[PDB]
From Swiss-Prot, chain A:
The C-terminal domain (CTD) serves as a platform for assembly of factors that regulate transcription initiation, elongation, termination and mRNA processing. The trigger loop allows entry of NTPs into the active site, switching between an open and closed state with each NTP addition cycle. Residues 375-416 are annotated as: Trigger loop. It is linked to Neurodevelopmental disorder with hypotonia and variable intellectual and behavioral abnormalities: An autosomal dominant neurodevelopmental disorder characterized by profound infantile-onset hypotonia, developmental delay with poor speech, delayed walking, and impaired intellectual development. Additional variable features include feeding difficulties, dysmorphic features, and visual defects. Changing Y401H: In NEDHIB; uncertain significance; moderate. It comes from the Eukaryota. This is DNA-directed RNA polymerase II subunit RPB1. The chain holds residues 709 to 1415 of 1970 of the full protein. Residues 124-165 are annotated as: Bridging helix. Changing M61T: In NEDHIB; uncertain significance; severe. It is found in: Nucleus; Cytoplasm; Chromosome. Changing I140T: In NEDHIB; uncertain significance; moderate. It comes from Homo sapiens (Human).
From Swiss-Prot, chain D:
This is DNA-directed RNA polymerase II subunit RPB9. A zinc finger (TFIIS-type) spans 82-124. It is found in: Nucleus, Nucleolus. Zn(2+) 1 binds at C17, C20, C39, C42.
Curated annotation (Swiss-Prot), chain E:
Catalytic core component of RNA polymerase II (Pol II), a DNA-dependent RNA polymerase which synthesizes mRNA precursors and many functional non-coding RNAs using the four ribonucleoside triphosphates as substrates. Pol II-mediated transcription cycle proceeds through transcription initiation, transcription elongation and transcription termination stages. RNA-dependent RNA polymerase that catalyzes the extension of a non-coding RNA (ncRNA) at the 3'-end using the four ribonucleoside triphosphates as substrates. An internal ncRNA sequence near the 3'-end serves as a template in a single-round Pol II-mediated RNA polymerization reaction. May decrease the stability of ncRNAs that repress Pol II-mediated gene transcription. It is found in: Nucleus. Belongs to the RNA polymerase beta chain family. It comes from the Eukaryota. The gene is POLR2B. This is DNA-directed RNA polymerase II subunit RPB2. The chain holds residues 246 to 392 of 1174 of the full protein. It comes from Homo sapiens (Human).
From Swiss-Prot, chain F:
The modification N-acetylmethionine is found at M1. One of its GO terms (molecular function) is DNA binding. This is DNA-directed RNA polymerases I, II, and III subunit RPABC1. It is found in: Nucleus; Nucleus, Nucleolus. The lineage of its organism: Eukaryota, Metazoa, Chordata, Craniata, Vertebrata. It comes from the Eukaryota. Component of the RNA polymerase I (Pol I), RNA polymerase II (Pol II) and RNA polymerase III (Pol III) complexes consisting of at least 13, 12 and 17 subunits, respectively. Pol I complex consists of a ten-subunit catalytic core composed of POLR1A/RPA1, POLR1B/RPA2, POLR1C/RPAC1, POLR1D/RPAC2, POLR1H/RPA12, POLR2E/RPABC1, POLR2F/RPABC2, POLR2H/RPABC3, POLR2K/RPABC4 and POLR2L/RPABC5; a mobile stalk subunit POLR1F/RPA43 protruding from the core and additional subunits homologous to general transcription factors POLR1E/RPA49 and POLR1G/RPA34. (Microbial infection) Interacts with HBV protein X.
Length: 707, 50, 170, 125, 147, 210
């Protein structure tokens, strides 16, 4: 690996490396050596874990997960690896060097902070000091995080403290305003929930039909007398056929609503009881043999689930609004409960008897009824500590960005502080534009929208500027342009006697000009529109080998006859031409018009979980594509541009979301942003707590930062 | 646990491999206990016991 | 026949288009009338623009600029011999010109570099270790954060970006 | 003109008054149709030698073989190279280095300085 | 606005808690070097490079309003001293500050006013090098620059 | 050149106001809802004599919901910045027509005296004001935004009775909230917010307008 780094350094000094997208050549180089040294550590790290014998007590502590980990084994047995500080290799402290022990500009691994040794062989002197540098960043990080998080937590508790669930189970604060109609939108307790799988998100419509449908045609497989017992006698029933056919009709409709609720296609939801483990407790105790024939009537199952559905009271009432509240609030548990306890599912898979099923119904009823949150509780305070706690956990400014772009979407506590304050001017605002279908599978369409979205000022497009003295173009000092002057004899042939003899000539960079796909008439029309008709412009052909633009300034002709004393106080036009030259650059906003410009990068996403679509088979599918990620805020206008998605275009900046999309859209975006920051550690803070947090800040339309 | 061959070993017919832990009717049938069985895990023995 | 005209500006624009067609004397060896063709071109442009605006004037000049290119006399020769009809010459929709050659490559090369600006941006980490228990792919990333720790020891976090799935080592 | 040209018109930012020793400024002569340079604090005036009065950016004055003095050849901290041939003198051994500037431009490319008193020659590769 | 605009050349100087910033060329004129050719020489005595010289050029143009040392001293006084009446004490007060409080380490007498001017100029030069990027910024922690 | 975009925009804003008219329930033609860009271009026969007062012609009436109580009227002023004078004539126009509500779409901005005058129009006919750029795209289609439905005063009465609340104790929403503006609701009215929920699947809220 060291020879391979010297090899990459040899390629780099030759000037021929060919840089990586969106990066300077040093970054391409730095990204590459960093890839090699990391791969070097991981290869020998994987070698040492293999080489360990069965009896290594060190491996026995790592494997139980008691204390310590794989990386420690890597460092003690193998090789410690590249140290870094602020996410980069050890800086050049002295003139172009880390220590006087090295040569100036020495990008090798060791010379800039790679530790070749293991803790067991001991570190060499330079490695020790670069290791002592890696030691500080962690000690300092510790002292800061303790102060900041102590403050963030106190402020948060101090807001929410008076929120609490009342005895009619609506959650209200001190002045008795309602926060939620039901706590956490279902009225369940957070300590009684569990992760569960939703059966009905099963891919393929045909596959769902096969596994769930209770057939009546009976395939010659001992039908009616296989699995089920006396049920062979109710095969002739019309009513039972129509009622189950009605059951399956609800399951297709539930499957359809459930696909709308979870568009991403995750089956993991928090719900009470865990119906599947209960069926197992039920099977295990009654001594149910799954090969022996069944002893259960299907209608007993279907109606029993209806009755249980009615017993699971979460909203007491009787009028149409209470029934709708009861029905919608425990929609997600109810569709889950029908899916688990399905007649075909029950009969084939779980094989439960009648006595076992009646008992099972009775426990779920008792556990669900026990799960409903206890009014009186302090819910507001409970939530602040569950939010406060992950701010305690990890990362202040450490870089682990793997989204192939800018560092942007600041990670960790400083980002949390921004959402918490609702900063009118975030340190790093962002915005994600998704692109319309056709323009998303093609690069060239993507390039054309990208250029329209970018914001570039003529100063960036200009290679160079010059100002010349040339009263007579017909004998211009710039003899090569002379061909153009003859080309523009008919270009207003009369007011050449009147226009100022001062000349501005601009030359444009050829690659950069082409990249924006601009044409000269666009520039001329832009500059004409900005300064006015007074600014007399001419330009050469876009296909000449030296792409050039020539600018003069025309007056008002008739009235300028030295009336009083020229109401300009006799400003020389050259001096004025600099002010035109200055402002022409600083002002001209072609394509993109405000604060975002072309800051772009363009990205291909195939890694993430984007563009999740439905297919006619019924199953979900991945749809890779081009998406545009910007580093700026202008959501109101940027939505209205063509082929930009008016649906999934989003921004991390909650103040701009407020302006455009109102208070409810803030409530969601802020939740996603708070969820997303907690999710970086992925300790998974329970959602009900963040809903409560968002509701308190968005409670009264106007944004109420907790400041 | 580290054990076996994630994603394709249990499908390699279940030569019990002893790694995976199974408990039934209050008796430990097979496997080895670790932090993922006993720790602060979402599905640890301790959570189920409560 | 060439369409009738009376405007003095239109007449001089034809004369200039004709004069541009006179460049390099190729018109002699072919023997094609540059004055009838320039008039037909100009009529076709005017049929597009319908006046003698700056935009028409810019188009006349760019038509002139195409005729006067020193590195591509073959474009003119193609117009002179009728390989390009005047109605086609009148419109620059059909691209711009690609027989001086190197500049077309360069514009292609520009089209490469902005496409180079699309390539990944900067792909990441790529440790490639454990297999995911969801979408059955090994393309995975790992996170190393909180060294020593308070009481949640530097455990190893592994995430499957392929479907946003995260699990721990052990 | 020709593509293989250059743009060093001689930006004469210095041409002080022969009398009061201060800077000359442009000003028009409409009578003679010629640019002239005059001191503001006095009548003295003289015609210009160029039609230019100001330029900006070149963007790539890559600035590769200027400012850096040959004597940098003496510095013990710079890497001596066994790589041969001063393209001027028939002698090997050169000190080399890179950028050493904040307008780093991204110039990763190496600059080599001959070290024997016969050249002081400064090339690039 | 429509002045020339360009703010990124306007080099000024804070003198020790003077209630107002002063343009650097005025300070040079207060030292007595009224000739611009001389001021330019004191900033950079290697005028083979047009770019840096052009860079200072608008600040010389900005200075143009005054070209006498006495007036420049009265100017700094008004830019320093609370409002009053006579000009002459203001010139003297301004003179002792310019003499004693301006880089004392280079001298505290009349007879070394010229040498001080040289040090100011290397300092402006030291500044211009960083703005062109010819020379890396100083490090805020380099122990070599601590006592 | 930009003129050619305009047609897409004029098509595009007319379509958004149609959906807006349709959500309020003013019964627009399904075909007007269905109207494509190509048809609209066909409808004003694009390309001739630009800058022509297409928008004065684009001015449309919309009649309905459930009870034909006159109509709602939609006006696109030709002027980039509309002043009180254009409003006064427009007022003469709304009064002659005896219409009941007027929506004006201004291309850049309205003079503050006109907004004032719009304020003083409040007792009589109601005037609603949209900035052309925010109207140019249907915000209510966006994924962040849950389904909003306005309730009648009777339904609000039953709601407060059945939960036993005071008007004051409900969650509030801005009178200038882009969504509140979209429906054009006034103070005291309640909006029913219907949301997808990770844990409820569906969750229903109400917000009293403040
Ligand atoms: Zn996966
Ligand atoms: Zn003079
Ligand atoms: Zn030599």
């Amino acid at each position: 690996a060291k020879q391979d780094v010297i090899e990459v350094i040899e390629k780099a000094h030759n000037n021929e490396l060919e840089p990586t997208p969106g990066n300077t050549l040093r970054q391409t180089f730095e990204n590459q050596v960093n890839r090699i040294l990391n791969d070097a550590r991981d290869k020998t790290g994987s070698s040492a874990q293999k080489s360990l014998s069965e009896y290594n007590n060190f491996k026995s502590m790592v494997v139980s997960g008691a204390k310590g980990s794989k990386i420690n084994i890597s460092q003690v047995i193998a090789v410690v690896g590249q140290q870094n500080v602020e996410g980069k290799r050890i800086p050049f402290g002295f003139k172009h060097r880390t220590l006087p022990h090295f040569i100036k500009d020495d990008y090798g691994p060791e010379s800039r902070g790679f530790v070749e040794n293991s803790y067991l062989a001991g570190l060499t002197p330079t490695e020790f000091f670069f290791h002592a540098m890696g030691g500080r960043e962690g000690l300092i990080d510790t002292a800061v995080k303790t102060a900041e998080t102590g403050y963030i937590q106190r402020r948060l508790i101090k807001s929410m403290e008076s929120v609490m669930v009342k005895y009619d189970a609506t959650v209200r604060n001190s002045i008795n305003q309602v926060v939620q109609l039901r706590y956490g939108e279902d009225g369940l307790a957070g300590e009684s929930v569990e992760f569960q799988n939703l059966a009905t998100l099963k891919p393929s419509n045909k596959a769902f039909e096969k596994k769930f449908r209770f057939d009546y045609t009976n395939e010659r497989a001992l039908r009616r007398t296989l699995q089920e017992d006396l049920v062979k006698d109710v095969l002739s029933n019309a009513h039972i056929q129509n009622e189950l056919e009605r059951e399956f009709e609800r399951m297709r409709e539930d499957r359809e609503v459930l696909r709308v609720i979870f568009p991403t296609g995750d089956s993991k939801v928090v719900l009470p009881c865990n119906l599947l483990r209960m069926i197992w407790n039920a099977q295990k105790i009654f001594h149910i043999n799954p090969r022996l024939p069944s002893d259960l009537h299907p209608i007993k199952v279907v109606e029993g689930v209806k009755e249980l559905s009615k017993k699971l009271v979460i909203v007491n009432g009787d009028d149409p609004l209470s029934r709708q509240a009861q029905e919608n609030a425990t929609l997600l548990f109810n569709i889950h409960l029908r899916s688990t306890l399905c007649s075909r599912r029950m009969a084939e898979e779980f094989r439960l008897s009648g006595e076992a099923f009646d008992w099972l119904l009775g426990e779920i009823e008792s556990k669900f009824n026990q799960a409903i949150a206890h009014p009186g509780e302090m819910v507001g305070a409970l939530a602040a500590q569950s939010l406060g706690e992950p701010a305690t956990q990890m990362t202040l400014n450490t870089f682990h960005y793997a989204g192939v772009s800018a560092k942007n979407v600041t990670l960790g506590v400083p980002r949390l502080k921004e959402l918490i304050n609702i900063s009118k001017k975030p340190k790093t605002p962002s915005l994600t534009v998704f692109l319309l279908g056709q323009s998303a599978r093609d690069a060239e369409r993507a390039k054309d929208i990208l250029c329209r979205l970018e914001h570039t000022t003529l100063r960036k497009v200009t290679a160079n500027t010059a100002i010349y003295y040339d009263p007579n173009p017909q004998s211009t000092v710039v003899a090569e342009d002379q061909e153009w002057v003859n080309v523009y004899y008919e270009m207003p042939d009369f007011d050449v006697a009147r226009i100022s003899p001062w000349l501005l000539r601009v030359e444009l960079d050829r690659k950069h000009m082409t990249d924006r796909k601009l044409t000269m008439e666009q520039i001329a029309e832009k500059i004409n529109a900005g300064f006015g008709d007074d600014l007399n412009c001419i330009f050469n052909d876009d296909n000449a080998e030296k792409l050039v633009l020539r600018i003069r300034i025309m007056n008002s002709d008739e009235n300028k006859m030295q009336e009083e004393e020229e109401v300009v106080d006799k400003m020389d036009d050259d001096v004025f031409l600099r002010c035109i030259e200055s402002n022409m650059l600083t002002d001209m906003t072609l394509q993109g018009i405000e604060q975002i410009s072309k800051v772009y990068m363009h990205l291909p996403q195939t890694d993430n979980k984007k563009k999740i679509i439905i297919t006619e088979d019924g199953e979900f599918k991945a749809l890779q594509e081009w998406i545009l990620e910007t580093d700026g805020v202008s959501l109101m206008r940027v939505l209205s541009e063509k082929d930009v998605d008016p649906v999934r275009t989003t921004s991390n900046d909650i103040v701009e979301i407020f302006t455009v999309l109102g208070i409810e859209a803030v409530r969601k975006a802020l939740e996603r942003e708070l969820y997303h920051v907690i999710s970086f550690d992925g300790s998974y803070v329970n959602y009900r707590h963040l809903a409560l947090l968002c509701d308190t800040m968005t409670c009264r339309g106007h944004l109420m930062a907790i400041t | 646990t580290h054990p076996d061959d994630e994603d394709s070993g249990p499908y390699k017919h279940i030569s019990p491999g002893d790694t995976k832990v199974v408990v039934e009717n209050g008796e430990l049938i097979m496997g080895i206990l670790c932090k993922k069985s006993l720790g602060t895990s979402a599905g640890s023995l301790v959570h189920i016991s409560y | 026949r060439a369409p009738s005209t009376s405007d003095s500006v239109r007449l001089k624009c034809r004369e200039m288009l004709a004069a541009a067609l006179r460049t390099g004397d190729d018109y002699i060896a072919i023997g094609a009338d540059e004055e009838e063709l320039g008039s037909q071109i100009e009529e076709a442009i005017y049929q597009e623009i319908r006046n003698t605006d700056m935009k028409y004037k810019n188009r006349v000049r760019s038509r002139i600029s195409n005729l006067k290119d020193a590195k591509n006399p073959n474009l003119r020769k193609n117009v002179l011999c009728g390989n390009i009809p005047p109605d086609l010459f009148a419109r620059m929709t059909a691209e711009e010109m690609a027989s001086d050659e190197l500049k077309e490559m360069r514009k292609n090369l520009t089209k490469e570099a902005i496409r180079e600006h699309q390539m990944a941006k900067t792909g990441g980490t790529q440790t490639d270790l454990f297999t995911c228990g969801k979408c059955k792919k090994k393309n995975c990333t790992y996170t190393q954060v909180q060294t020593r720790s308070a009481d949640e020891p530097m455990t190893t976090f592994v995430v499957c970006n392929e479907c946003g799935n995260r699990w721990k080592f052990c | 003109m020709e593509p293989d040209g250059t743009y060093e018109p001689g930006f004469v930012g210095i041409r002080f008054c022969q009398e009061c020793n201060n800077m000359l400024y442009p000003k028009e002569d409409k009578e003679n149709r010629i640019l002239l340079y005059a001191c503001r604090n006095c009548d003295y005036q003289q015609e210009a030698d160029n039609s230019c009065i100001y330029v900006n950016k070149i963007t790539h004055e890559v600035d590769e073989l200027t400012q850096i003095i040959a004597d940098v050849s003496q510095d013990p901290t710079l890497p001596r190279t066994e790589d041969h041939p001063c393209q001027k003198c028939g002698h090997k051994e050169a000190v080399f280095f890179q950028s050493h500037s904040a307008r780093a431009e991204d110039a990763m490319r190496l600059y080599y300085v001959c070290t024997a008193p016969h050249c002081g020659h400064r090339w690039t590769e | 606005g429509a002045k020339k605009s360009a703010i990124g050349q306007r080099i000024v100087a804070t003198l020790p808690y003077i209630k107002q910033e002063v343009p650097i060329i005025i300070v040079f004129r207060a030292l007595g070097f009224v000739s611009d050719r001389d001021i330019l020489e004191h900033i950079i005595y290697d005028f083979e490079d047009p770019e840096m010289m052009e860079m200072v050029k608008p600040s010389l143009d900005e200075a143009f309003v005054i070209q006498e040392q006495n007036v420049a001293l009265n100017f700094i006084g008004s830019r320093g001293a609370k409002p009053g009446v006579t000009k002459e004490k203001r010139i003297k007060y301004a003179k002792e500050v310019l003499q004693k409080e301006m880089l004392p380490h280079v001298g505290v007498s009349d007879f070394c006013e010229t040498k001080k001017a040289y040090f100011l100029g290397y300092m402006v030069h030291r500044l211009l090098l960083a703005a062109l990027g010819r020379r890396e910024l100083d490090d805020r922690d380099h122990y070599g620059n601590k006592r | 050149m930009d003129d050619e975009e305009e047609t897409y925009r004029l098509w595009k804003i007319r379509k958004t106001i149609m959906q807006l008219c349709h959500d309020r329930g003013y019964l627009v033609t399904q075909d007007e809802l269905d109207q494509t860009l190509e048809e609209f271009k066909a409808q004003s026969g694009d390309k001739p004599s630009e800058g022509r007062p297409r928008r004065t012609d684009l001015t449309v009436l919309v009649a309905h919901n459930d009870d034909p109580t006159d109509q709602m009227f939609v006006f696109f002023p030709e002027e980039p910045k509309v002043g009180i004078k254009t409003i006064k004539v427009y007022c003469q126009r709304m009064q002659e027509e005896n219409i009941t509500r007027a929506l004006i779409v201004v291309q850049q901005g309205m003079t503050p005296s006109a907004k004032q005058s719009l304020v003083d129009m409040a007792p009589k006919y109601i005037l609603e004001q949209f900035l052309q750029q925010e109207l140019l795209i249907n915000i209510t289609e966006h994924e962040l935004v849950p389904e909003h439905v306005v309730m009648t005063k009777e339904e609000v009465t039953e709601l407060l009775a059945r939960y036993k609340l005071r008007e004051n104790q409900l969650p509030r929403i801005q009178a200038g909230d882009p969504v509140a503006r979209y429906f054009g609701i006034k103070r005291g009215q309640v909006v029913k917010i219907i949301r997808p929920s990770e844990t409820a699947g569906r969750y229903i809220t109400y917000r009293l307008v403040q």
